[PDB]
Symmetry: C2
């Protein structure tokens, strides 16, 4: 179908250097690409800004050389200078996934209450069980993303106060 | 009412929360006398010391003032352990002017807090914007967030799996 040999070559070849992506894994299957859509339906290439609190779609193209049961396809985000502020996967969602040979598309959505700033997106593909975890394709960092908001808040959590009573 | 700044400074010092090792400072021309927190089910943190990740929380402040004070900033924030604030906001950001009257009054905020499971600290500050610190409470109290839904980091934004 597609040789792991090819997937290994794909993996080594397609590595984003604008973020200094370090990429590892057995490459039995790989994250061929990730495309991110905003609520208005536009991409990051089309508009690289995400509004704080916007619903985002993560469109994964997964390319597998063979079938692989019980995988974990995860994604996370860190501040341009720091550790992860957000991370999740199908495992956290309680949703099992099995990869089939050839291309396949897995789609996640999330509403991201993240304050304005520059962040990094990471994603990872691994096999959960049968012995210990097996990393298939870990992409770190995969891409940059900037959040913007109508008004500025403290920290990273976008949770604006509602004023119920101002003693007025 | 008839409360003096002298009285408020005394209250400020003796009602500092020792459990959290609270540091408290400011002129105390007005003070944050109390903060009661309600969860979306109507229960207080005192009744049920636990907030569900992502739920709507109500902050019921009781403020004591020794005199009328215009252009007030009442801020709240949260942090984890020895870290900096992970969330913060105030009436100023929200675009709501506050003027304190003499005596006791209430200021009430809501926020929907997508904070992952863990132990956090709540900080609050009262000041007159130009800043004169009136009453800064760091940390005022502990708060525990929980969810059966587990995530990484502090941001509770669970993925939904659309297409497998
Ligand atoms: Cl309470």
């Amino acid at each position: 179908e597609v040789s792991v040999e090819e997937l290994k070559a794909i993996q080594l070849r397609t590595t984003n250097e604008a973020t200094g992506e370090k990429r590892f894994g057995s490459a039995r299957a790989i994250i061929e690409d990730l495309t991110i859509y905003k609520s208005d339906g536009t991409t990051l290439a089309e508009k690289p800004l995400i509004k704080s609190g916007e619903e985002v779609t993560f469109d994964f193209t997964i390319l597998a050389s063979e079938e692989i049961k019980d995988i974990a396809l995860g994604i996370s985000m860190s501040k341009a200078q720091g550790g992860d502020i957000w991370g999740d996967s199908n495992i956290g969602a309680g949703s099992a996934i099995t990869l089939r040979p050839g291309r396949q598309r897995i789609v996640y959505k999330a509403t991201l209450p993240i304050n304005s700033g520059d962040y990094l997106i990471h994603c990872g593909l691994a096999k959960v069980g049968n012995g210990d975890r097996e990393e298939l394709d870990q992409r770190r960092p995969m891409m940059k993303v900037k959040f913007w908001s109508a008004r500025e808040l403290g920290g990273v959590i976008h949770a604006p106060l509602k004023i119920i009573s101002n003693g007025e």
